[PDB]
Amino acid sequence: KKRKV
Amino acid sequence: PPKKKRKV
Amino acid sequence: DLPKMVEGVFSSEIDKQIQATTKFRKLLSKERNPPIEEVIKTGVVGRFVEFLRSPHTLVQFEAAWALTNIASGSATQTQVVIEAGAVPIFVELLGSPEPDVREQAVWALGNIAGDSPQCRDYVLSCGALRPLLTLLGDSRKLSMLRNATWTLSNFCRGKTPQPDWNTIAPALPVLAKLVYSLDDEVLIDACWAISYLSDGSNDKIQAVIEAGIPRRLVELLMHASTSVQTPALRSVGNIVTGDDVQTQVIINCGALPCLLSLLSSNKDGIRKEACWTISNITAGNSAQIQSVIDANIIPPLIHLLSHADLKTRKEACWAISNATSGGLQKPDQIRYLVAQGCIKPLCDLLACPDNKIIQVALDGLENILKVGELDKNAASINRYALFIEECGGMEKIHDCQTNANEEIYMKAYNIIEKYFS
């Protein structure tokens, strides 16, 4: 659910 | 964070 | 006079070599528009590389300086230096007994590695990293520490591709020490290097954590210099893109009150990245959402949802919507988000040209609606659905049925069906 660069 | 540096 | 200088460089006498090389060094060091192309065309670059192996440290130094500045130029000018075989010799010179020669070799390698990921990888393949890291642990000279940290950051920089992880990972224990530097330039470049290395898969984040870096990074969030704050914050933000345990390290290091402060930064980019960072925390588990709530971060986020630039609003949207994920486990969180006025700004974002933002706003609103329905059945209407309706929100969800994508106008339809029919 995380948005990386 | 410059990619390059010129000396003097 | 150029031809006489070339003659001097091709001389076999050390004094003539030094005088001519010094003249080239000065040409290449002029204030504006150094004649790099002209110098290359004279054919002296190969001689400069020969001079790097001279027992006379002065000609080593002057030649290294000339080569450094040729490499400060274009990709093709840098390639001339590479083709001449400078890089393995610069790596040897990192172990020179003369500190000025060591330092100039650091600089040259910085410029060469800075040209591209391909040049970076060539420099690393020649074994530059270990002797560079040794200098960073040993030197007490500020100019060397500065130059070597900058060069190290170029060894870490670039994503097309990223450097080989096991090759570059030895940098981490050294960077962990450099973030305690009393010098701002070292601090800035060390933080940037960490920002590059921490961007990637979660095993890399774990390596950063095990190096002990998070605690000092969190402290640097409130550094006086925005030039330190920016890469420190990018690094903290990278770490909370990891799993829940990794993200918890950042919370436990006390980052949340810092992140609250950074939402009031004078720099738009810092406010934006603080929102991004917070969003990856509210993407976490129920306790992590609660930590953000307990840190009083929700009202400023809702403020930024409406004010601030579009890039910041997008991040705030993610943060607030992510925080609606626990309607089953702890619906009190959503009821608080609603009490703080999240519904109207989320509805206004349904007209955002970016379909990703539309989807995220719709996701949050559906999560809100489910709790409103839940509250109804225990009581008789859905109070939140009523909220959405009279603020003009219902119409905006209704226009989302003509969105032409997939999970958006399907989402919009189901909401109208279940809540506004």
Author numbering:
A (entry chain A): 128 to 132
B (entry chain C): 125 to 132
C (entry chain B): 82 to 460, 466 to 507
Sentences reproduced from the published study:
To better understand NLS recognition and gain insights into the N. crassa nuclear import process, we report the first crystal structure of Impα from a filamentous fungus (NcImpα) in complex with a classical monopartite NLS (SV40 large T antigen NLS). NcImpα was expressed as an N-terminal truncation lacking residues 1–74 (which corresponds to the IBB domain;) that are responsible for autoinhibition. The crystals are not isomorphous to other Impα/SV40 complexes and diffracted to high resolution (1.75Å), which is the highest resolution obtained for an Impα to date. The final model of the NcImpα/SV40NLS complex consists of 428 residues of NcImpα (79–507), the peptide ligands bound to the major (seven residues) and minor (four residues) sites, and 349 water molecules. The structure exhibits an elongated and curved shape composed of ten tandem Arm repeats, each containing three α-helices (H1, H2 and H3;), as observed in other Impα structures. The SV40 NLS peptide binds the major binding site of NcImpα in an extended conformation with an orientation that is antiparallel to the Arm repeats. The average B-factor of the peptide at the major binding site (33.2 Å2) is lower than the average B-factor for the protein (37.7 Å2), indicating stability for the interaction of the peptide at this site. The average B-factor for the SV40 NLS peptide bound at the minor binding site of NcImpα is higher than the average B-factor for the protein (39.3 and 37.7 Å2, respectively), indicating a lower stability for the peptide at this site compared with the major site. The interactions between the SV40NLS peptide and NcImpα in the minor site exhibit greater similarities with the interactions between this peptide and OsImpα than those with MmImpα or ScImpα. The crystal structure of NcImpα resembles other Impα structures but exhibits a conformation that is more concave compared with MmImpα.
Importin-α (Imp-α) is the receptor for cargo proteins that contain specific nuclear localization signals (NLSs) that play a key role in the classical nuclear import pathway. Impα is composed of tandem armadillo (Arm) repeats that generate a curved and elongated shape. Impα also contains conserved residues that form two NLS binding sites known as major (Arms 1–4) and minor (Arms 4–8) NLS binding sites. Monopartite NLSs primarily interact with the major binding site, whereas bipartite NLSs interact with both minor and major NLS binding sites.
